[PDB]
Design a protein around this ligand. Sequence first.
Ligand SMILES: Nc1ncnc2c1ncn2[C@@H]1O[C@H](COP(=O)(O)OP(=O)(O)OP(=O)(O)O)[C@@H](O)[C@H]1O
Ligand SMILES: [Mg+2]
Lengths: 466, 466, 44, 518
Amino acid sequence: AKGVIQEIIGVVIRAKFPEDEVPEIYNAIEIPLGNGDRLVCEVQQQLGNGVVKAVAMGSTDGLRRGLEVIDTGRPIAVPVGPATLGRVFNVLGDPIDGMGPIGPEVERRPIHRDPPSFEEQNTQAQIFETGIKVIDLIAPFTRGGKTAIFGGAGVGKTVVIQELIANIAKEQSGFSVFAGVGERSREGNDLIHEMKEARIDENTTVFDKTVMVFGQMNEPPGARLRVGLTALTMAEYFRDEGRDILLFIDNIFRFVQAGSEVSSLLGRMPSQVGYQPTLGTEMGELQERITSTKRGSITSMQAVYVPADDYTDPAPATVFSHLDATISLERSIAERAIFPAVDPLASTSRILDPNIVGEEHYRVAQEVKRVLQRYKDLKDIIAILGMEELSDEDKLTVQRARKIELFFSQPFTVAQQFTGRPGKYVPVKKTVESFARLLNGEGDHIPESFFYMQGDFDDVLAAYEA
Amino acid sequence: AKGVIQEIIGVVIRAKFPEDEVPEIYNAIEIPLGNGDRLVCEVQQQLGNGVVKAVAMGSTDGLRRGLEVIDTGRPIAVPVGPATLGRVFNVLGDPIDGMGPIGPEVERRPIHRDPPSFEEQNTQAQIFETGIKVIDLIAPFTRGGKTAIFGGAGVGKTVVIQELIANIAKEQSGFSVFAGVGERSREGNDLIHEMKEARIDENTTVFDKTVMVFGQMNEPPGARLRVGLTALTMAEYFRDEGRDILLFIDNIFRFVQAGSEVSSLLGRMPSQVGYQPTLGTEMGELQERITSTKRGSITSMQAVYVPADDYTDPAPATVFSHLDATISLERSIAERAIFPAVDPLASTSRILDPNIVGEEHYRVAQEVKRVLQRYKDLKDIIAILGMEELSDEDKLTVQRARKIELFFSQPFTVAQQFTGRPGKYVPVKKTVESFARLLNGEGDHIPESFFYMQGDFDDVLAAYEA
Amino acid sequence: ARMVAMRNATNNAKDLVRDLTLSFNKARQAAITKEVSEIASGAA
Amino acid sequence: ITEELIARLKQGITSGVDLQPRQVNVGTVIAVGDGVARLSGLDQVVASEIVEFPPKAGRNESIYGIALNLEQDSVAAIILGDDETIEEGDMVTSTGRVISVPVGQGLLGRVVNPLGQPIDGKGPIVYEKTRPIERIAPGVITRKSVDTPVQTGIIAIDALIPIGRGQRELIIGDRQTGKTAVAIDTILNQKGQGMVCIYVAIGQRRAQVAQVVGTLERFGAMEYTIVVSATASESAALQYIAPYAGCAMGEEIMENGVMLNGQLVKDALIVYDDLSKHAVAYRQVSLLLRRPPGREAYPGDVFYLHSRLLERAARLNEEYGGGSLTALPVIETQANDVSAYIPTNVISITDGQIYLESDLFNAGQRPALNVGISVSRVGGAAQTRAMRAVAGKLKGELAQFRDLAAFAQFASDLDATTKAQIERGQRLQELLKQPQYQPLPVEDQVAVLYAATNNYLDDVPVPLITKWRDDFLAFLRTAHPEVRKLIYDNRLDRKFPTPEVKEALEAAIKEFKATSNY
Ligand SMILES: Nc1ncnc2c1ncn2[C@@H]1O[C@H](COP(=O)(O)OP(=O)(O)OP(=O)(O)O)[C@@H](O)[C@H]1O
Ligand SMILES: [Mg+2]
């Protein structure tokens, strides 16, 4: 080890090393900053005789060529274990919260792991029961499978995230990891800190049950590129213990953009619309460690920002190639106070097939979407001439569709203190039975109210009687 | 101070000078030819060991790889003074007109000069009095400001230029400069020279009050690049005397294009769509010398040609970043015998706010262009309704719009010997008062064609009384 | 009849807008690809 | 007591200087390009030092440069001054400091370079502290949720797109639309709100910056405003470092504060007048340094470029001082190409957008905000309780009108409720129209919006609505000065329309409407 800086061009630096002991690729070389603090650079290329090209992941403004460089001999070492729970880290594993250092006794693992082998993968797909009626019915989760959420963040996305964390914490092993890739320091860090510390469940705050890794906006492209890998490294410790983990990645498109910026800085030839040539490979290094293995499962929900409005753009296309379910939060559904503002028609899922979720689940879900689709077609006509022109049965479908879309609302345990309403966890079988019994004709006499922010059909009736 | 040519690639010449006598970054190289004249280059990049890369300014179809080059020490020196008035010059300041060379006694000034400092800039925008009603009302100029005409041929743009020169030379001292940058030699020359020599005012031809510098499309990119700076130096000489200068940079866009080529041949790394990386700075170094200081003001009215019809293109966008007013000459207005083809709409100016021009000027300028805000949209209705025979009140608005459209026309002094009609100089106060009183309804008694070519409303009245 | 005809025309116009949006996005991606390709070629 | 001067001297003279000669490392310029020098072997140079280029024959001054590229056997130094004087073979000395700018009370009402050198010609800068350009953002746990509102003074922004202290609202628009006008209106409205505005003017013309400074001085806003300026003619290095100098000057206000009107002001507002021109300057710098380009020829670290700059704008908590730094970046799009590279980068970075459209600007809606697409993710937290309580119905009715915006010219042949909604939307849109350099205080906006949301302007015709406002406030300014103070005093009350202020405002509106005719 003990190299010397040979070149500093922006974040991309080059370090010369002896002919032997040259660092490997992704080896996290360290530059002392003249004090206790240090600058960790990740080696991305090996050039000629000992020269290695690396990405700064830091300010790299106080550096001078000829400065000492130390090879760590391993990728970025991220602390893992129960000590990470309730703490907030950056890409390098340093805790950025008020609390002190993690400590040398805690195990540190390389950031660049390998996805589970072919043997360890589950042969069959198991449905992940989140407990939210609309999520578990229209676009059911997949255990160990990726999931995308589409929203403008003003539609209660954080509420859904907190509800998922609380549900897994209280009804499963329940550990979660939140990767703030490209996360704003104000909107995405302190606001979420206050929301997660204030939100409580069974005398334990949500923040105590989650590990938060923030690759912020102000960090160089390498940090935003590797923050997701840091989050996977942290979650893999809990996955290896047999627990089930939820990984929430905010704006995976920002991870794609960070990769593109790193590739542009390294000099690699551009591909398609300003995208890295290693787009598929980089998306495969990520989102492949998110699998349901024999020991445990990591299920991930990933916010996806669509450039312009292209679902054919290479970044959302590569994201979609690895997705099992899409949830489309929509503004109008949230303007009316339906907080679980999941658009049933737009939101889909791969696991919603008879051979996995059951024939009854598939049949009711299709009928729910069918009547809603008919309602969407008649949204024009109702504004055209009034509800009067609509034929009977079609008038029922409009009446029933409004009731069912109001019934998609569900009280949340994390929102209990704000709204003064206890949360209701509706199992998938209970959801299927309730919606089938709503469709078949029961509850038709009940008005649109009494379905708002309720649990199962049993709750809708008991309320009607009282 | 003598070097040897090393390489010749097109219009880019590399020349090796002695170690201690390397020319500066903008000096002239002045390659001597066998037949008596010289090829003046312009340094662009000091590099290597005494080697300078320069732009040819000429053909370079007769040069070997050993010819001597005589550094001139100073940048391209251009003749400035009253002597360089009423004469046509090239980029190098050599008079290309029939008359003899400029005498050695005339002061030569460097082509590259520092724009005026921030302290000398006027703290309040001031309107520039042209005398044209439509120009001084719809799109007022700025003292030391930039204006662009968007018009082709046959719309009287040349006559507008001639009248602007004549008006500034009569009301003020008003010497004028015309830099044809990348113009057709047919349009720019022998159709501007002859028209301005024929056009006369106070027994003095317009050409006698105007300096001309012409870098045409046939000349190498460096000539078209530095012709604008030549004209700026010639105008800045008079500006130093305190006299007001009107400068017409015809096809400022062809300036930008020239720079692009100069960069492509210089090995500079391309920016955006092939354009030079130094686009904003190059445009600033030319558009910042056009400003109103305490001593004098160089008012500029440029011409911009947008490739295809793309205002998104980097060259038009960079031009517009430095523009204060736009005048949109139109074919439809020109073919209607309206001699000033300035469109009342699509002709904007940032001076048109009540803080600078005045509340009354803004009020009337909003009263007009409001009856035409619809562009008499009634004209579409008249086409399929015949006015519904007549409009309840719209028919009045149509009458007022037609009257004011006719009134925008004005007899020009430069055309006084062509159409046999005396030229009318209309102050801005007269224009605002005339249009306001016409909009009140005083102009509802005279028929149309009485506003056809008259300077003021009072002049229209005199005609009605007689 | 005019109401029905305008409803059909609005639906057709919306479908044409969707098709033109797809075409415009394809053209936009192609333009970005061409620009970056020529910029990389000029750099190299 | 001159003896104190003699004692302080004659002691540092005798034993305060080493005077020991030593070898110092310099560099030789070996190639001067389009503002780029190579400096050959200048070792011990920091990655962003400011090299000196000491004076030589024919040059009595020094042009400084930034050593951006620390290559092997070469240091590509971007030149801050004019490159026409630096020639091959010139000696350079590596000043050991990264670029720092003077900060504090001294830089108020003064126009300065990005290097802190005054350009207004009113004397040397008086200062005692220099803050480093390019410092790390305040941090995650160092901030607090944005709660205090920044009163823009424009009804549209202050009512529908709230800006709070610490919030980063983006002013994005197309060419001449009013972005600088909105920024200047915001700056002029902070006369008594205890805020120190900063204007950066990246790449603007000298004439435009001069007119902006003249407007600020004419309204008396150049006693709390710091104007930085890196104009178009100046080198790309100055335009590249202008916003960072501005935000360092603002971070001094945020952390230490300055005495404004005899009060410790720790809130600052900074307006980056063109990040679309700062990005162009950085692109020129990168391409002249032959760094690998990316999309639209911008370098790879151009998102990082604006991200560093904007992520230093924060609302610090009480532990770290309680200061603030509001950022108002300005972007000039081309033909409303929001999907362009720099606009998308800054939109993703910022916490909100104020979309200014040329269509509305030309139509007559002079504040050309497009409320449909303009967002403020802070939202109601950046509004006083009065404005939050009153603007909800405004936003709802404006949205309803926008849904029916295609129907304005067919309002007669429509439903009574649809015609009423269209008419109310037209009245509200005419209300949001505002002249230049006439910011309305919070109480005036609250009064006007309370009169509008409640059915009080229904009888007033649309073309006179603006006039109505311009009269009504004048009435409240002269006839009923107490109701304005009553509104302003309990603007923070949770239930703002408390009966006292409700009756006072109702009576004022009725009295104004009874006397006036429209
Ligand atoms: N709110 C307003 N009220 C009245 N006039 C306005 C307003 N906003 C803009 N204008 C008018 O539009 C002109 C251009 O506005 P402004 O200079 O603010 O635009 P901009 O978007 O900053 O343009 P640029 O790209 O040229 O810097 C002003 O000089 C003024 O005449
Ligand atoms: Mg502006």
